[PDB]
Amino acid sequence: MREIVHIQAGQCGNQIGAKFWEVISDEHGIDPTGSYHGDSDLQLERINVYYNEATGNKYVPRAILVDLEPGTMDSVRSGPFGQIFRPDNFVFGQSGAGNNWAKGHYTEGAELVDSVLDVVRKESESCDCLQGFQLTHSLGGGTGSGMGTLLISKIREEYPDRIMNTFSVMPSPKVSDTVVEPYNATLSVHQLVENTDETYCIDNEALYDICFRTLKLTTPTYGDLNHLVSATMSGVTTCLRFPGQLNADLRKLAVNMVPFPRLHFFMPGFAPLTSQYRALTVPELTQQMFDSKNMMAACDPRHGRYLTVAAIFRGRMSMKEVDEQMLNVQNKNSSYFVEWIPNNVKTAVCDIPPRGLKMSATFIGNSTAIQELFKRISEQFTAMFRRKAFLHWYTGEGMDEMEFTEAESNMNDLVSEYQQYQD
Amino acid sequence: MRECISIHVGQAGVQIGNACWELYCLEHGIQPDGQMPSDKTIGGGDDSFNTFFSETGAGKHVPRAVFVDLEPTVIDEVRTGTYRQLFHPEQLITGKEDAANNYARGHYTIGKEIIDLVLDRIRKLADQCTGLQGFLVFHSFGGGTGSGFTSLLMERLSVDYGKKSKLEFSIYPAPQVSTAVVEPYNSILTTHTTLEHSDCAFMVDNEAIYDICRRNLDIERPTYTNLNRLISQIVSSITASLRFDGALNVDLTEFQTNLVPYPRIHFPLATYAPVISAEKAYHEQLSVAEITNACFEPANQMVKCDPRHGKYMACCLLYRGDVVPKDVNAAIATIKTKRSIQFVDWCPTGFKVGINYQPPTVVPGGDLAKVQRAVCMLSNTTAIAEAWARLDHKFDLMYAKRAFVHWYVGEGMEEGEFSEAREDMAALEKDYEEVGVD
Amino acid sequence: MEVIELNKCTSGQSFEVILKPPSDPSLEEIQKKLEAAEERRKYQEAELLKHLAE
Amino acid sequence: MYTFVVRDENSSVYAEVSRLLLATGQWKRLRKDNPRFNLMLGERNRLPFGRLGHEPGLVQLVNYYRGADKLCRKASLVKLIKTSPELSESCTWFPESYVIYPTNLTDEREVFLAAYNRRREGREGNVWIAKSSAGAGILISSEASELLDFIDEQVHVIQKYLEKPLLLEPGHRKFDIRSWVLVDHLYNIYLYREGVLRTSSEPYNSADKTCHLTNHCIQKEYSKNYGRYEEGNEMFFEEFNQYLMDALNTTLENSILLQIKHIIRSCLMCIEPAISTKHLHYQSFQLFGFDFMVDEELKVWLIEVNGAPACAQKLYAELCQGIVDVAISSVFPLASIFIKLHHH
Ligand SMILES: Nc1nc2c(ncn2[C@@H]2O[C@H](COP(=O)(O)OP(=O)(O)OP(=O)(O)O)[C@@H](O)[C@H]2O)c(=O)[nH]1
Ligand SMILES: Nc1ncnc2c1ncn2[C@@H]1O[C@H](COP(=O)(O)OP(=O)(O)CP(=O)(O)O)[C@@H](O)[C@H]1O
Ligand SMILES: Nc1nc2c(ncn2[C@@H]2O[C@H](COP(=O)(O)OP(=O)(O)O)[C@@H](O)[C@H]2O)c(=O)[nH]1
Ligand SMILES: COc1cc(S(=O)(=O)Oc2ccc3[nH]c(C)cc3c2)cc(OC)c1OC
Ligand SMILES: [Ca+2]
Ligand SMILES: [Ca+2]
Ligand SMILES: [Ca+2]
Ligand SMILES: [Mg+2]
Ligand SMILES: [Mg+2]
Ligand SMILES: [Mg+2]
């Protein structure tokens, strides 16, 4: 049994995490009470990866809900699948992080981090073979950004030989809460570079554009954006949650997707983009999958090169045709794949499709074009930091200007590292 | 009677070994519960098939095999398969987490924790042998367990069984059916550390087997079951001499004598014919000359290469079925004029021929049709160096950027071991050229 | 064209046809490098904890 | 849309071929080291044939035949004709040649001396010529001691010099017929309908090496009459056929081309079982340049075969288009000028 411990921190991390558990509980036939009511035994072959079996054939998610405010977690407990989580796994504070990285990471989250690790330890001790942890959070706030990275750093100290995986939501001025989001994002990115094995870069700018340009939504809400995240998270965990001839685990993904330890930020993609009765052919799935308009990272793949690519097709389809279309993409646009990593595109097919779709495809790409995302964050960071604007919110929590300068340098170094492998 | 111990390491070794022992039981008439009705000596006997099967007091014929994998999923299929009653649980060894396609993780980190246990279980079988010939090691180049742990095992076997031969059946990596992007790294590392320990290695390129299944068996997308059932036929032909009465390749030492003139050049090229789809109603049964001629067609070789551009050092013809020596000699004279078979000057241009009257056995309901005669050719050709060149070029592309190297260093490997392993491969290609120069 | 060494039995027969005449480390050394790798592995983990302690 | 890479920058023939492929809009050129290609215009030396035909879902084609060096090198061509029963040492259209290794360095040194000494005793012409694959170094001497001492100063070969070559009357000079042959993946032997005659500009003298060697580069440097009779010392088939009808009362098709097509078929059918790519995992085509010499009795002799020939300036447009039509587009279809030499 290769179990995964799920952690969700902050408002964004819990709302996105709650939707993720709502989606995959439906896929595994788990009702909000926690009882299995499915048909196929394939829904329970690897149910232990994300669920713990309780007395009376009850399935409880191996999830830990963390926040410095009680508001969002009260919504989750009152949500559709709120009754499925362990009451013990609700670890929350009262003051909040105030959209401040320092409060999450240094002052307010420090008071709460130890109690979270006790729940992490309680879940890890009851695992036959713990393969790692996955964290859902945003980088532009204070709790998921500040405390989440603090949790990652402390979890690595206690579990150094386990895989750290994150679903990290990048801030964007298009969908913005505070002007200090570039500060929080730049501080978090430096943490993610050193302490995570795989990070799915979910850009709120990309999610907004997909809802606006593609799905034709004039005023997208966070629910609309989180619908795209749920589809992506379900897709990128399909190989973990469903049986296949690949025996997929987190470590194997990291070994094959990450050729250099710091370049572990993946571009997720999904097809078809949904917000609907016509079936999608395999050539259509492959074309949309590599299309920039289906990318969740707001980067143009044609502006860089793919180091490694992992693709997941879901539904009853011709595996012969899937290999035809995947090879067609590589042989056509071979200039967008590195020629010094042979066979850097992996394809897996799962017979069980997501809810409401006959055919779907999920894209996981380690493209050097992701530097555009870090360039965008860096430019927004520098424009404020050159004038030391809003810095008092952080120096009042004990931080120093030097820490921001180091984070800025690490951010620009990461762009330099992604740039050298583009030639 | 001199026994042989088969060792299956990693997913490829276990599943291919599962197919081989399934075929062995069919060929020897052994039932899935280990009962062999034709065996009259119950609990004993020094027959030819006893080199692969031990006999219990209850008459159950137990294979002389050990299955090793750092992950339990694959071997659990053997524990709950049709032939679960064959083995006993001491022969099946499983870990908890696999090597994650990492040679270092299977050799230095996770292999070091299980190497002593496997040797103990091997010794349990070695003590049941009156005279042990050696070991047949099944593994893949690409897998972390198949590459990392095998090389560690081969090092220890050369220390504890220094007077015993070791033969390898190795799965050469192919993108058509692959599992990792670091397989070129693992393939080079495991060949460097096993080269001085393996006496004779039969490489099976998954690309060749994949194409044969598509071309000859009309399989759209061949599965591991399709590939392994075809591979077991080649393995059965190679090991048929050890399990049946005969005079050619009767012991493991004879494989090195007949096929390996230079110790480092110990990779004979295997070619098999005929591969006939069972879906066809009745295909024309090919003649001795027709199947022998197919041995010199690249499309039937286990490794895609061009023997015309490479000198021969040795050649064996292992026929199974309705074959008489008069037909074989007539076929050879015809082939030597049409084909360009150039041996090296320091070797006699000749052919060692072995015939087994029992026709090839096929799995009931399988994809391979029953034929009245088949041949497997074992030719030590310098043309097999093309496979090393392909593998070394992919190695050089990734290593020039040091891609994925940190995963190996993080397990204790040194970056210099990569270059040391690669320079040995460069020397191996030099040795092949020095023998195949015009 | 010459056939030599014709051996026959019940299960089959074998022969050779000639067409043209011609013209290890010890257990100690294994464990030394094995434990050396575990030493570098333990050194690299100690450096990580030292970095994390800072 | 098809893909191809270029690995021979000095190939003047395939530089035009690469231009035509890009001009069709359905061929994309990649980097020389990219493995995902449909076509390869590989290099002359050390072409990596072992890496071809191993890409899933990629029909790969290369513009060279592996093992064709046995026909395009001086020593191997003589060794091939002597040993091959199809060509035989009794071959009537190949000048009597011998393989000679330098004394500093199998060898046929004593065999050359036996036939040479017979000609001196028999009052016959005993003029021979020595050359090697490392030429621009050619010695034409009547005494055998001069040729052997020059070879000692790589592997060389010595063959009987055509002491009585066919000389064009308006100038009394020697010509050199070049025919271009294209063999496709199906091993169809296509002979270009157009050829050239690298004629000389100096009168042939039986007793100097300017009127004896009819190379285009040599006739440009050592000879000052370059272009006196024909442009560039290169006569085409239409002009040369007319001269035969006026001065010899015969035609180029009958007196010369019948023998040329016979020599082309015999050489290529001989090495077919060794270079054929019918059952191989990749396909091969190659353009060859055959050099012939005609004697006074209108008999065609084979000089040597070029694996990397250069076409005439006028015929580049027609020939390179024909390469794409029958060798490249036959395998990779898009959206005659050859004579098919039928065989078995
Ligand atoms: N012919 C054949 N090849 C196989 C089979 N299983 C795996 N392979 C090949 O083996 C290579 C990977 O090695 P594996 O055996 O799967 O890995 P492993 O030995 O279990 O080691 P781990 O990395 O720990 O899983 C791939 O290139 C596959 O093509 C099989 O059943 N038959
Ligand atoms: N046996 C012979 N008799 C008469 N002339 C001969 C001859 N052998 C060679 N020659 C002359 O010498 C010239 C050069 O010989 P050869 O054809 O080997 O040169 P090369 O190798 O430079 C030609 P390419 O440019 O095709 O490589 C020929 O064009 C011919 O005129
Ligand atoms: N996609 C998505 N983004 C969100 C959501 N909630 C907040 N965000 C983004 O996250 C940032 C705010 O972080 P937040 O989660 O509120 O901070 P925290 O609660 O203190 O950890 C802003 O950039 C928002 O755009 C959500 O539900 N979905
Ligand atoms: C947990 O997520 C996944 C894990 C895996 S894996 O365990 O087989 O790792 C591998 C193995 C070989 C590889 N080659 C390349 C280029 C990437 C790669 C990844 C495959 C996936 O889909 C293809 C996954 O996506 C849901
Ligand atoms: Ca407090
Ligand atoms: Ca018995
Ligand atoms: Ca040994
Ligand atoms: Mg908020
Ligand atoms: Mg495995
Ligand atoms: Mg010349």
Resolution in angstroms for this experimental structure? 2.6
Roughly how many angstroms between the first and final C-alpha of chain A, as a whole number? 42
- Count other C-beta atoms under 10 Å from residue D42's C-beta: 21
Fold for A370-423, please state it.
Answer: Helix Hairpins (1.10.287)
**Main-chain dihedrals φ then ψ at residue A165, nearest 5 degrees:** -125, 140
Decide: A197 in ligand 4 pocket, CB within 6 A: no
Q: Which two tokens stand for residue B432?
A: 């092949």
Distance CA B405, CA B402 (A): 6
- Residue of the nearest CA to atom 29 in ligand 2? D214
Q: In chain C, count of helices (H) and strands (E)?
A: 1, 2
Q: CA distances (Å), A87 to each of A68, A164, B155, in order?
A: 17, 24, 53
What residue type is assigned to position A394 of the chain? Y
For D63-208, list the strands marked E by DSSP: 97-100, 128-132, 139-141, 156-160, 167-168, 173-174, 177-183, 189-192, 196-198
Closest CA to A188 of A11, A420, A407, A9: A407
| Burial of A351 from C-beta contacts in 10 A (0-12 / 13-18 / 19+) | middle
Give CA separation, D330 vs A102, D16, D59, D108, D340, in Å. 68, 18, 12, 44, 15
What sign for the dihedral angle of Cα B387, B390, B393, B399? Answer: negative
Q: Which fold has domain B384-438?
A: Helix Hairpins (1.10.287)
Domain A260-369 maps to which CATH number in 3.30.70.580, 3.30.1330.20, 3.30.70.250, 3.30.300.100? 3.30.1330.20
What is d(CA B210, CA A7) in angstroms, rounded to the nearest whole number?
A: 43
Helix (H) or strand (E) holding D152: helix D144-152
Ligand sitting nearest the alpha carbon of B106? 1
Which residue's structure tokens are 């620009």?
A: A412
Residues of chain A with CATH 3.40.50.1440: 2-259
The answer to whether B95 and B69 are in contact (CB under 8 A) is: yes
The residue of chain C nearest to residue B198, with distances taken between CA atoms, is: C24
- Residue A334's Cβ-side half-sphere holds a number of Cα atoms within 13 Å equal to 27
Omega before residue B274 within 30° of 0, cis? yes
Phi-psi group of D227: left, alpha or beta (phi > 0 → left; psi -120 to 50 → alpha; rest → beta): left
Tell me which residue has tokens 């997501």: A354
Please enumerate in sequence order all residues whose Cβ is within 8 A of that of B280, keeping only pairs 6 or more positions apart, or say none.
B369
Residue B167: half-sphere exposure toward Cβ, Cα within 13 Å:
23
* DSSP helix/strand/coil, D96: coil
Measured CA angle at B358 (ends B352, B359), to 5 deg: 95
Considering only CA atoms, which of A385, A413, A344 is closest in space to residue A184?
A385
Question: Comparing B269-383 with B384-438, is the CATH topology the same?
Answer: no
User: Would you give the DSSP letter of residue B343?
Assistant: B
Superfamily of domain B1-268: Tubulin/FtsZ, GTPase domain (3.40.50.1440)
Centre of ligand 4 to C-alpha A47, Å, is: 19
The ligand that comes nearest to the alpha carbon of residue A165 is 4
**d(C-alpha A202, C-alpha A169), whole Å:** 5
Q: Residue A191: closest CA among chain C residues belongs to which residue?
A: C52
Q: DSSP for B254-296, please give it.
A: HHHHHH-SSSS---PEEEEE---BTTSS-PPPP-HHHHHHHTT
D partners (3+ CB pairs within 8 A) are A, B
CB proximity list for B275: less than 8 A, separation 6 or greater: B212, B216, B217, B230, B300, B368
Separation of CA D231 and ligand 10 centre (Å):
18
CB B95 within 8 A of CB B112: no
Q: Buried b vs exposed e over B75-88: b needs ≥16 C-beta within 10 Å?
A: beebeeeebeebbe
Cβ contacts of A406 within 8 Å, gap of 6 or more: A190
Task: Indicate if the alpha-carbon torsion angle A146, A150, A153, A159 is positive or negative.
Answer: negative
Catalytic residue flag (residue B423): no
Can you give the residue ranges of every domain in chain D? Answer: 1-63, 64-95+164-344, 96-163
End-to-end CA distance of chain C: 81
Pick the CATH number of A2-259 from 3.90.226.10, 3.40.50.720, 3.40.190.10, 3.40.50.1440: 3.40.50.1440
| Angle, vertex CA D183, rays to CA D177 and CA D187, nearest 5 | 140
- Candidates 3.30.1490.20, 3.55.40.20, 3.30.9.10, 3.30.70.100; correct CATH number of D96-163? 3.30.1490.20
Q: Is there a contact between A331 and D33 if contact means CB atoms under 8 Å apart?
A: no
From B55, B254, B386, B411, the catalytic residue = B254
Considering only CA atoms, give the Rg of chain A. 20
Q: Is the Cα dihedral B406, B412, B417, B422 positive or negative? A: negative
In chain A, count of helices (H) and strands (E)? 15, 12
Assign domain D1-63 to its CATH architecture. 3-Layer(aba) Sandwich (3.40)
Using a CB–CB cutoff of 8 Å, tell me whether C16 touches chain B: yes
Q: H helices then E strands: how many in chain D?
A: 11, 18
User: Which structure tokens are listed for B269?
Assistant: 């090229």
CB neighbours of C28 closer than 8 A, spacing ≥ 6? Answer: none
E runs forming strands in B162-309: 165-172, 200-205, 269-273
CATH 3.30.470.20 is the classification of domain D64-95+164-344 = yes
B403 touches chain A (CB under 8 A): yes
Chain C CB within 8 Å of residue A422 CB = no
C-alpha to C-alpha distance for B391 and B387, rounded to whole angstroms? 6
Cβ proximity of B313 and B381 under 8 Å: yes
Whether residues A339 and D57 touch (CB distance < 8 A) is answered with: no
Structure-block tokens of residue A309 = 């690519």
CA atoms within 13 A on the CB side of A328: 14
Architecture of the domain made up of B269-383: 2-Layer Sandwich (3.30)
Closest residue by Cα to residue B195 from B41, B362, B422: B422
Strands A345-350 and A360-367: unpaired
Ligand 3 pocket, residue A300 CB under 6 Å: no
Experimental method for this entry? Answer: X-ray
For residue D102 the two structure tokens come to 């330098």
